[PDB]
Amino acid sequence: ANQPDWADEAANGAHQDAWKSLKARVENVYYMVKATYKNDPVWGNDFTCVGVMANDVNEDEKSIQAEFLFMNNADTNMQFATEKVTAVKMYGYNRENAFRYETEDGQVFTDVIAYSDDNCDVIYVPGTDGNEEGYELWTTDYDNIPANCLNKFNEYAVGRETRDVFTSACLE
């Protein structure tokens, strides 16, 4: 199958619920505190300070409209954006476990939830089309990292070097 040992629905699916994760973002802001890579087609090159908030809950499509803040080398200050995100299935799952980001002009990019709890996610970025493979970590409070997600993130990102993404310094 060419997939990570953690993509195992029978074992891990109760903690890999993307649709529930997308909707959590409607009630609370999510911030990307750490990642293991620096160039993404969605975030940009040398990205930092990524966070999100969501609206336009569509149960039929399992999609939301996401508003991102983020920083990359395209500009010196905070940038904003709007994209559609849809909960989809990857690695042979019965139940949606993946984030399909869609740009206005139809570009699609899909990341997989490796692990999630009510206030955090660990998100995997397969990196195909020659992109960078790595891991992300998100929480509802950039000052406070939930330990289960951190634990899972350090485990799954083993052998990779970690770096900060959204810290307090982002909002001076």
PDB file of C-alpha atoms in Angstrom:
ATOM      1  CA  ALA A   1       0.000   0.000   0.000  1.00  0.00           C
ATOM      2  CA  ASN A   2       3.007   2.315   0.555  1.00  0.00           C
ATOM      3  CA  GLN A   3       1.640   4.021   3.669  1.00  0.00           C
ATOM      4  CA  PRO A   4       2.767   4.785   7.255  1.00  0.00           C
ATOM      5  CA  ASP A   5       2.244   2.204   9.993  1.00  0.00           C
ATOM      6  CA  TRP A   6      -0.130   4.654  11.663  1.00  0.00           C
ATOM      7  CA  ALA A   7      -2.587   4.564   8.729  1.00  0.00           C
ATOM      8  CA  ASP A   8      -4.493   1.712  10.324  1.00  0.00           C
ATOM      9  CA  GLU A   9      -8.198   2.301  10.587  1.00  0.00           C
ATOM     10  CA  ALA A  10      -9.083  -0.675  12.850  1.00  0.00           C
ATOM     11  CA  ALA A  11      -6.413   0.405  15.346  1.00  0.00           C
ATOM     12  CA  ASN A  12      -6.470   4.242  15.052  1.00  0.00           C
ATOM     13  CA  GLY A  13      -9.684   5.477  13.327  1.00  0.00           C
ATOM     14  CA  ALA A  14     -11.404   6.730  16.448  1.00  0.00           C
ATOM     15  CA  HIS A  15      -8.585   9.307  16.666  1.00  0.00           C
ATOM     16  CA  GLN A  16      -8.465  10.099  12.924  1.00  0.00           C
ATOM     17  CA  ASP A  17     -11.797  11.746  12.340  1.00  0.00           C
ATOM     18  CA  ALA A  18     -11.234  14.570   9.770  1.00  0.00           C
ATOM     19  CA  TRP A  19     -14.843  15.683   9.498  1.00  0.00           C
ATOM     20  CA  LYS A  20     -15.018  16.210  13.244  1.00  0.00           C
ATOM     21  CA  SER A  21     -11.678  17.965  13.026  1.00  0.00           C
ATOM     22  CA  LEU A  22     -12.801  20.384  10.225  1.00  0.00           C
ATOM     23  CA  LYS A  23     -15.856  21.390  12.247  1.00  0.00           C
ATOM     24  CA  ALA A  24     -13.866  21.987  15.438  1.00  0.00           C
ATOM     25  CA  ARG A  25     -12.197  24.802  13.466  1.00  0.00           C
ATOM     26  CA  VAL A  26     -15.600  26.558  13.163  1.00  0.00           C
ATOM     27  CA  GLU A  27     -15.987  26.960  16.929  1.00  0.00           C
ATOM     28  CA  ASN A  28     -12.287  27.654  17.701  1.00  0.00           C
ATOM     29  CA  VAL A  29      -9.206  29.083  15.963  1.00  0.00           C
ATOM     30  CA  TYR A  30      -6.531  26.464  15.227  1.00  0.00           C
ATOM     31  CA  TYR A  31      -2.795  27.318  15.028  1.00  0.00           C
ATOM     32  CA  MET A  32       0.075  25.273  13.486  1.00  0.00           C
ATOM     33  CA  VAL A  33       2.609  25.302  16.341  1.00  0.00           C
ATOM     34  CA  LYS A  34       5.207  22.980  14.820  1.00  0.00           C
ATOM     35  CA  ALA A  35       6.179  21.276  11.569  1.00  0.00           C
ATOM     36  CA  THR A  36       9.094  19.251  10.280  1.00  0.00           C
ATOM     37  CA  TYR A  37       9.402  20.788   6.783  1.00  0.00           C
ATOM     38  CA  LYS A  38       9.690  24.403   5.393  1.00  0.00           C
ATOM     39  CA  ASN A  39       8.222  24.576   1.858  1.00  0.00           C
ATOM     40  CA  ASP A  40       4.534  23.904   1.097  1.00  0.00           C
ATOM     41  CA  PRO A  41       2.394  24.778  -2.011  1.00  0.00           C
ATOM     42  CA  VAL A  42      -0.372  25.951   0.247  1.00  0.00           C
ATOM     43  CA  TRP A  43       1.541  27.694   3.045  1.00  0.00           C
ATOM     44  CA  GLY A  44       4.365  28.937   0.840  1.00  0.00           C
ATOM     45  CA  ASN A  45       8.145  28.817   0.989  1.00  0.00           C
ATOM     46  CA  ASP A  46       9.750  29.215   4.407  1.00  0.00           C
ATOM     47  CA  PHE A  47       6.352  29.376   6.101  1.00  0.00           C
ATOM     48  CA  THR A  48       5.614  30.429   9.641  1.00  0.00           C
ATOM     49  CA  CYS A  49       2.636  31.659  11.698  1.00  0.00           C
ATOM     50  CA  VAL A  50      -0.096  29.506  10.065  1.00  0.00           C
ATOM     51  CA  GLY A  51      -3.529  29.386  11.702  1.00  0.00           C
ATOM     52  CA  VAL A  52      -7.086  28.912  10.551  1.00  0.00           C
ATOM     53  CA  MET A  53     -10.730  29.600  11.223  1.00  0.00           C
ATOM     54  CA  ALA A  54     -13.695  28.061   9.498  1.00  0.00           C
ATOM     55  CA  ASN A  55     -17.248  28.660   8.406  1.00  0.00           C
ATOM     56  CA  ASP A  56     -19.850  27.583   5.878  1.00  0.00           C
ATOM     57  CA  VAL A  57     -20.360  24.110   7.292  1.00  0.00           C
ATOM     58  CA  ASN A  58     -21.710  21.876   4.536  1.00  0.00           C
ATOM     59  CA  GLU A  59     -22.711  18.435   5.894  1.00  0.00           C
ATOM     60  CA  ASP A  60     -23.560  17.016   2.498  1.00  0.00           C
ATOM     61  CA  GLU A  61     -20.142  17.814   1.060  1.00  0.00           C
ATOM     62  CA  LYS A  62     -18.216  17.529   4.385  1.00  0.00           C
ATOM     63  CA  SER A  63     -16.533  20.792   3.466  1.00  0.00           C
ATOM     64  CA  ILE A  64     -15.948  24.176   5.069  1.00  0.00           C
ATOM     65  CA  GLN A  65     -14.568  27.546   4.002  1.00  0.00           C
ATOM     66  CA  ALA A  66     -11.288  28.174   5.745  1.00  0.00           C
ATOM     67  CA  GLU A  67      -9.693  31.527   6.342  1.00  0.00           C
ATOM     68  CA  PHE A  68      -5.959  31.255   6.874  1.00  0.00           C
ATOM     69  CA  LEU A  69      -3.417  33.619   8.299  1.00  0.00           C
ATOM     70  CA  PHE A  70       0.166  32.793   7.470  1.00  0.00           C
ATOM     71  CA  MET A  71       3.574  34.154   6.691  1.00  0.00           C
ATOM     72  CA  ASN A  72       5.987  33.158   3.928  1.00  0.00           C
ATOM     73  CA  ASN A  73       8.722  34.705   1.768  1.00  0.00           C
ATOM     74  CA  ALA A  74       6.206  36.249  -0.659  1.00  0.00           C
ATOM     75  CA  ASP A  75       5.698  39.144   1.756  1.00  0.00           C
ATOM     76  CA  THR A  76       7.118  40.651   4.973  1.00  0.00           C
ATOM     77  CA  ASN A  77       3.888  40.826   6.992  1.00  0.00           C
ATOM     78  CA  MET A  78       0.863  38.665   7.793  1.00  0.00           C
ATOM     79  CA  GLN A  79      -1.119  37.450   4.804  1.00  0.00           C
ATOM     80  CA  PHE A  80      -4.657  36.164   4.583  1.00  0.00           C
ATOM     81  CA  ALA A  81      -6.423  33.789   2.251  1.00  0.00           C
ATOM     82  CA  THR A  82      -9.630  31.850   1.786  1.00  0.00           C
ATOM     83  CA  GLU A  83      -9.793  28.193   0.681  1.00  0.00           C
ATOM     84  CA  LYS A  84     -12.240  25.308   0.653  1.00  0.00           C
ATOM     85  CA  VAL A  85     -11.335  22.234   2.656  1.00  0.00           C
ATOM     86  CA  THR A  86     -13.100  18.897   2.353  1.00  0.00           C
ATOM     87  CA  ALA A  87     -12.842  15.793   4.554  1.00  0.00           C
ATOM     88  CA  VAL A  88     -11.874  12.894   2.222  1.00  0.00           C
ATOM     89  CA  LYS A  89     -10.725   9.250   2.507  1.00  0.00           C
ATOM     90  CA  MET A  90      -7.121   8.080   2.035  1.00  0.00           C
ATOM     91  CA  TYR A  91      -5.154   4.839   2.525  1.00  0.00           C
ATOM     92  CA  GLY A  92      -8.215   2.647   2.176  1.00  0.00           C
ATOM     93  CA  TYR A  93     -10.310   4.148   4.976  1.00  0.00           C
ATOM     94  CA  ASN A  94     -14.081   3.702   5.375  1.00  0.00           C
ATOM     95  CA  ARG A  95     -14.350   6.980   7.264  1.00  0.00           C
ATOM     96  CA  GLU A  96     -13.024  10.377   6.255  1.00  0.00           C
ATOM     97  CA  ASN A  97      -9.480  10.774   7.555  1.00  0.00           C
ATOM     98  CA  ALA A  98      -7.943  13.391   5.195  1.00  0.00           C
ATOM     99  CA  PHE A  99      -7.943  17.124   4.372  1.00  0.00           C
ATOM    100  CA  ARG A 100      -8.416  18.061   0.738  1.00  0.00           C
ATOM    101  CA  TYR A 101      -7.481  21.725   0.264  1.00  0.00           C
ATOM    102  CA  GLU A 102      -8.974  23.260  -2.878  1.00  0.00           C
ATOM    103  CA  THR A 103      -7.903  26.510  -4.508  1.00  0.00           C
ATOM    104  CA  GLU A 104     -10.420  28.711  -6.367  1.00  0.00           C
ATOM    105  CA  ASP A 105      -8.928  27.643  -9.746  1.00  0.00           C
ATOM    106  CA  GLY A 106      -9.167  23.926  -8.928  1.00  0.00           C
ATOM    107  CA  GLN A 107      -5.775  23.015  -7.520  1.00  0.00           C
ATOM    108  CA  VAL A 108      -6.071  20.205  -5.006  1.00  0.00           C
ATOM    109  CA  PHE A 109      -3.706  19.101  -2.263  1.00  0.00           C
ATOM    110  CA  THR A 110      -4.422  16.363   0.274  1.00  0.00           C
ATOM    111  CA  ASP A 111      -3.025  15.858   3.762  1.00  0.00           C
ATOM    112  CA  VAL A 112      -3.935  13.015   6.134  1.00  0.00           C
ATOM    113  CA  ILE A 113      -4.801  13.133   9.837  1.00  0.00           C
ATOM    114  CA  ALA A 114      -2.404  10.813  11.686  1.00  0.00           C
ATOM    115  CA  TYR A 115      -3.935  11.538  15.082  1.00  0.00           C
ATOM    116  CA  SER A 116      -6.452  13.905  16.597  1.00  0.00           C
ATOM    117  CA  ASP A 117      -8.071  14.925  19.890  1.00  0.00           C
ATOM    118  CA  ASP A 118     -10.601  17.604  20.726  1.00  0.00           C
ATOM    119  CA  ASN A 119      -8.093  20.426  20.764  1.00  0.00           C
ATOM    120  CA  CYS A 120      -5.284  19.219  18.520  1.00  0.00           C
ATOM    121  CA  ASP A 121      -4.249  17.323  15.410  1.00  0.00           C
ATOM    122  CA  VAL A 122      -1.160  15.765  13.963  1.00  0.00           C
ATOM    123  CA  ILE A 123      -1.322  16.036  10.158  1.00  0.00           C
ATOM    124  CA  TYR A 124       0.744  14.201   7.608  1.00  0.00           C
ATOM    125  CA  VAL A 125       1.838  15.711   4.331  1.00  0.00           C
ATOM    126  CA  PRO A 126       2.682  12.910   1.853  1.00  0.00           C
ATOM    127  CA  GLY A 127       4.624  15.214  -0.451  1.00  0.00           C
ATOM    128  CA  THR A 128       3.966  13.920  -3.927  1.00  0.00           C
ATOM    129  CA  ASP A 129       4.667  15.797  -7.199  1.00  0.00           C
ATOM    130  CA  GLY A 130       8.162  16.309  -5.773  1.00  0.00           C
ATOM    131  CA  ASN A 131       6.923  18.276  -2.742  1.00  0.00           C
ATOM    132  CA  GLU A 132       8.372  18.028   0.784  1.00  0.00           C
ATOM    133  CA  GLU A 133       7.233  15.120   2.997  1.00  0.00           C
ATOM    134  CA  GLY A 134       6.664  16.035   6.656  1.00  0.00           C
ATOM    135  CA  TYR A 135       4.370  16.354   9.668  1.00  0.00           C
ATOM    136  CA  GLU A 136       2.349  19.183  11.176  1.00  0.00           C
ATOM    137  CA  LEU A 137       1.009  19.938  14.702  1.00  0.00           C
ATOM    138  CA  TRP A 138      -2.054  22.080  15.461  1.00  0.00           C
ATOM    139  CA  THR A 139      -3.815  23.182  18.614  1.00  0.00           C
ATOM    140  CA  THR A 140      -6.441  25.677  19.802  1.00  0.00           C
ATOM    141  CA  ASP A 141      -3.891  27.647  21.931  1.00  0.00           C
ATOM    142  CA  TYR A 142      -0.430  28.440  20.599  1.00  0.00           C
ATOM    143  CA  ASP A 143       0.903  28.870  24.197  1.00  0.00           C
ATOM    144  CA  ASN A 144      -0.229  25.375  25.322  1.00  0.00           C
ATOM    145  CA  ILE A 145       0.469  22.113  23.517  1.00  0.00           C
ATOM    146  CA  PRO A 146      -1.700  19.108  24.421  1.00  0.00           C
ATOM    147  CA  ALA A 147       0.595  16.206  25.405  1.00  0.00           C
ATOM    148  CA  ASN A 148      -1.161  13.365  23.504  1.00  0.00           C
ATOM    149  CA  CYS A 149      -0.753  15.212  20.191  1.00  0.00           C
ATOM    150  CA  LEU A 150       2.803  16.204  20.981  1.00  0.00           C
ATOM    151  CA  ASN A 151       3.658  12.591  21.908  1.00  0.00           C
ATOM    152  CA  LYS A 152       2.105  11.298  18.686  1.00  0.00           C
ATOM    153  CA  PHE A 153       3.764  14.051  16.662  1.00  0.00           C
ATOM    154  CA  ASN A 154       7.268  13.355  18.003  1.00  0.00           C
ATOM    155  CA  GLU A 155       6.732   9.586  17.463  1.00  0.00           C
ATOM    156  CA  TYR A 156       5.474   9.741  13.878  1.00  0.00           C
ATOM    157  CA  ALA A 157       7.965  12.499  12.926  1.00  0.00           C
ATOM    158  CA  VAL A 158      10.835  10.376  14.217  1.00  0.00           C
ATOM    159  CA  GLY A 159      14.088  10.975  12.375  1.00  0.00           C
ATOM    160  CA  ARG A 160      12.952  14.431  11.261  1.00  0.00           C
ATOM    161  CA  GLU A 161      14.006  17.812  12.589  1.00  0.00           C
ATOM    162  CA  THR A 162      11.304  19.879  14.206  1.00  0.00           C
ATOM    163  CA  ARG A 163      10.782  23.660  14.020  1.00  0.00           C
ATOM    164  CA  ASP A 164       8.368  26.210  15.411  1.00  0.00           C
ATOM    165  CA  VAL A 165       5.561  27.557  13.182  1.00  0.00           C
ATOM    166  CA  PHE A 166       2.968  29.656  15.079  1.00  0.00           C
ATOM    167  CA  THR A 167       4.347  31.096  18.327  1.00  0.00           C
ATOM    168  CA  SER A 168       3.245  34.087  20.440  1.00  0.00           C
ATOM    169  CA  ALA A 169       5.723  36.274  18.498  1.00  0.00           C
ATOM    170  CA  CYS A 170       3.363  36.038  15.510  1.00  0.00           C
ATOM    171  CA  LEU A 171       0.903  38.415  17.104  1.00  0.00           C
ATOM    172  CA  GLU A 172       3.695  40.516  18.667  1.00  0.00           C
TER     173      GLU A 172
END
